[PDB]
């Protein structure tokens, strides 16, 4: 779930105070709450590995469903633009 334009601290406070209008709650663990420029993303593990974009979120961040460790889960990552290619330029 993406909370658009909201700081994750405010989301955590509102959840603990039971102030949010929707009555459902997304399972919160460490590393399951990630602050993006678009908003607060809860329910996806952020990873350092960059991949091609699948489900766009915004500001470079995209989510996908991928196998981690042993166990498929939703992850979020910074988009890869493409493979690198160094051209052997010379005179």
């Amino acid at each position: 779930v993406l909370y658009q334009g909201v700081n994750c601290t405010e989301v955590s406070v509102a959840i603990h105070a039971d102030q949010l209008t929707p009555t459902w709650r997304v399972y919160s663990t460490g590393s399951n709450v990630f602050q993006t420029r678009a908003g607060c993303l809860i329910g996806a593990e952020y990873v350092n590995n960059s991949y091609e974009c699948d489900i766009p979120i915004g500001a470079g961040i995209c989510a996908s469903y991928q196998t981690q460790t042993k166990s498929q889960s939703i992850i979020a990552y910074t988009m890869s633009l493409g493979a690198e290619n160094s051209v052997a330029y010379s005179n």
Binding site: N7, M79, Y89
Partner: protein, 438 residues
């Protein structure tokens, strides 16, 4: 019988500014029309699927703007880098290549382009601003239900696409656009681009230093012209101003009464009992729907205009950057040789590198040369005379050469060509044949 032919040339670099994307907006229909009011929302339900339609229209626009950005900039499948030497025959690209010493790795020109354009919407986690000052008005400040979504590609990602396109163009010419990138020395890329415009490759090599110096001067001139002139980035600022004006008007419409006793929904609910409040609320709902439908209709029209601009920008990037276009004035004034993209907020700037003929001289010409009763026509170029001797020259740059059998072809008797001029056509092979034995 008079023809003018350039004896010199000028390297000209011009700029073209195109919008690529529009600010992505989102409207909370319930917050805008019936903010925190159950009775108003329940009345709003009697108008059917209003919000269900605006949400789709604005989502379609937002997706279209990200599609437009990808179509213009995501034209390359690999991220190309230049060599660490960065010597390209004397051509100085330091003003268009990324500057490693600055954050975001923008070029100096890109840095100026981003600094000149003022962005009123400033999409970010707006709660960071909090309060403690007079409200910014950035245009609902979120509170009235109007928000701005960030782009999928950040300015750094767009800069990286631009850098990849620039490195590919510089190090491989057009072979990267069509297939795998093939390294080529830059001066030979220029030689082939000279051939593209009908000018023999040797013109580049004798004048390679002059061409490199004129190119570097033109780039410096662009840097200074963009810095000096305030209203340089007119089109992009106009797009920003139109979106800001649309949001300012949409928010300001909330203060209108539309015939109601008060523009504030809470005042209507506080002062009146349900049966009268419903009438005053219906009047406000009607006005709010008219405002939102007008806003969305103009946003759809602007989105179509931006889509057309983005499609033109993508076509220009494909034909001007990934190749050498032959379309006149498509890629700047002059004979198109090449272009360089630069990122700009909500758009793209193309730097078009062309040649302008200069220092022309008018020579006497002739459709054909008559020798031993045969009409000789040029294979390439035109015949010229300086008043005493006839020469064959390439059309786009003055370079006289002796008229020979190898330079011309023969078709028909001299009597058919109206303007044929009597002159000697030299015959190679025969001359040396004599020298061999005689």
């Amino acid at each position: 019988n008079s023809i003018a032919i350039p004896t010199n040339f000028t390297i000209s670099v011009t700029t073209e500014i195109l919008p690529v994307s529009m600010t992505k907006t989102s409207v909370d229909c319930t917050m805008y029309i019936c903010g925190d009011s159950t009775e108003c929302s329940n009345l709003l339900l009697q108008y059917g699927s209003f919000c269900t339609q605006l949400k789709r229209a604005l989502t379609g626009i937002a997706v279209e703007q990200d599609k437009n950005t990808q179509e213009v900039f995501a034209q390359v499948k690999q991220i190309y880098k230049t060599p660490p030497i960065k010597y390209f025959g004397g051509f100085n690209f330091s003003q268009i290549l990324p500057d490693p010493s600055k954050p975001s790795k923008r070029s100096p020109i890109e840095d100026l382009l981003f600094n000149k354009v003022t962005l009123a919407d400033a999409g970010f986690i707006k709660q960071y601003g909090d309060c403690l000052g007079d409200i910014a008005a950035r245009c609902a400040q979120k509170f009235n239900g109007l928000t701005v979504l960030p782009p999928l590609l950040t300015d750094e990602m767009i800069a990286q696409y631009t850098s990849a396109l620039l490195a590919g163009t510089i190090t491989s010419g057009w072979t990267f656009g069509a297939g795998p990138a093939l390294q080529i020395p830059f001066p030979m890329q220029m030689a082939y681009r000279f051939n593209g415009i009908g000018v023999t490759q040797n013109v580049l090599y004798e004048n390679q230093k002059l061409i490199a110096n004129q190119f570097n001067s033109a780039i410096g001139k662009i840097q200074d012209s963009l810095f000096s002139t305030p209203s340089a980035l007119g089109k992009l600022q106009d797009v920003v101003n139109h979106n800001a004006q649309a949001l300012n008007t949409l928010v300001k419409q909330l203060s209108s009464k539309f015939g109601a006793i008060s523009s504030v929904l809470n005042d209507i609910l506080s002062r009146l009992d349900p049966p009268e409040a419903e009438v005053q609320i219906d009047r406000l709902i009607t006005g709010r729907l008219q405002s939102l439908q007008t806003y969305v209709t103009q946003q759809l029209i602007r989105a179509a205009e931006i889509r057309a601009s983005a499609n033109l920008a993508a076509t220009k990037m494909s034909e001007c950057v990934l190749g050498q276009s032959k379309r006149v004035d498509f890629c700047g004034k002059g004979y198109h040789l090449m272009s360089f993209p630069q990122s700009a907020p909500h758009g793209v700037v193309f730097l078009h590198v062309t040649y302008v003929p200069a220092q022309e001289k008018n020579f006497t010409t002739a459709p054909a040369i008559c020798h031993d009763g045969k009409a000789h026509f040029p294979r390439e170029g035109v015949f010229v005379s300086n008043g005493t001797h006839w020469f064959l020259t390439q059309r786009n740059f003055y370079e006289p050469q002796i008229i020979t059998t190898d330079n011309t072809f023969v078709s028909g008797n001299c009597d058919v060509v109206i303007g044929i001029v009597n002159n000697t056509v030299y015959d190679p092979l025969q001359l040396e044949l004599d020298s061999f034995k005689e």
